[PDB]
Amino acid sequence: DHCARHGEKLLLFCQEDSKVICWLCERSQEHRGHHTFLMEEVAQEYHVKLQTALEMLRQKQQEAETERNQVAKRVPKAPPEEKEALIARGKALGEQTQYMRELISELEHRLQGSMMDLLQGVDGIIKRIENM
Amino acid sequence: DHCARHGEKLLLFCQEDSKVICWLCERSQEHRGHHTFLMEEVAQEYHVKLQTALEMLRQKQQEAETERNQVAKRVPKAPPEEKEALIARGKALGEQTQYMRELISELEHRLQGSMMDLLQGVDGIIKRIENMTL
Ligand SMILES: [Zn+2]
Ligand SMILES: [Zn+2]
Ligand SMILES: [Zn+2]
Ligand SMILES: [Zn+2]
């Protein structure tokens, strides 16, 4: 609830640092020219954003998994040289679906929690979504 | 010590309003376009200004009071046609010194007081003192 460096209320949010800060941080050279807001001014924008992200990921993950299970059902009938690559593909899908499970878990937490939960480090996960 | 509206520490100063305010005052629509500073950024100059004013008024006061007593001393001695004018001059001095006493008292309050006491409405009292002569 209070700034480690200044002891003032952690009520502001710095977009560039993706960090909740206090009014004295905001005046300081360390955040000079940064875009800073009350958390309450940006919470709803960020909530909407992550919500839609969560929806997109859940679908993308469902779709990945139906594909994965089709590749799984396909392995038995298939010849060897095809079998190996399909299994590799399934490996890749497993990797993807894991990654999306982690992302979905973080988005659910952030969307269920406080504003500070919502916002703190939020650029990290936004960029992880981008990097898919 | 704390903002009457937001409960935050009163550490900032609005130049257009001559008002002591907090960081939540500062960022609101009411002051966003105003020039705001930490009190501590402007305090020394204001303190010096009010001390100088105080000294100047102390001297103008001394001078008026001495004249006032010379007139008072002269009145008994005076002929009929001078007495009226003397009485009146003494009155006019009485008023001037009263006004100066009030100004001096406010300056003393401000110079002895908190930073907030110093700065709240400070442009106002400066201007009223300037206006006496000009
Ligand atoms: Zn801080
Ligand atoms: Zn920053
Ligand atoms: Zn305030
Ligand atoms: Zn103002």
Find the A14 Cα to ligand 2 centroid distance in Å. 5
Range list of β-strands (E), B1-128:
12-14, 19-21, 36-38
CA pair distance A23, A8, nearest whole angstrom: 7
* Paired residues of A38 in beta bridges: A12
Q: Are B36 and B15 in contact (CB under 8 A)?
A: yes
Contact B57, B100 (CB under 8 A): yes
* C-alpha distance across the termini of chain B, in Å: 36
Structure determined via:
X-ray
Residue B51, CA distances (Å) to A113, B14, B44, B47, B54 in order: 55, 22, 11, 6, 5
Amino acid at B7: G
Annotated binding-site residue? A109? no
CA dist., res. B134 & res. B128, Å (int):
10
Resolution of the experimentally solved model in angstroms? 1.9
Query: Ligand 4 centroid to B9 CA: how many Å?
Result: 16
Q: Would the annotation count B31 as a binding residue? A: yes
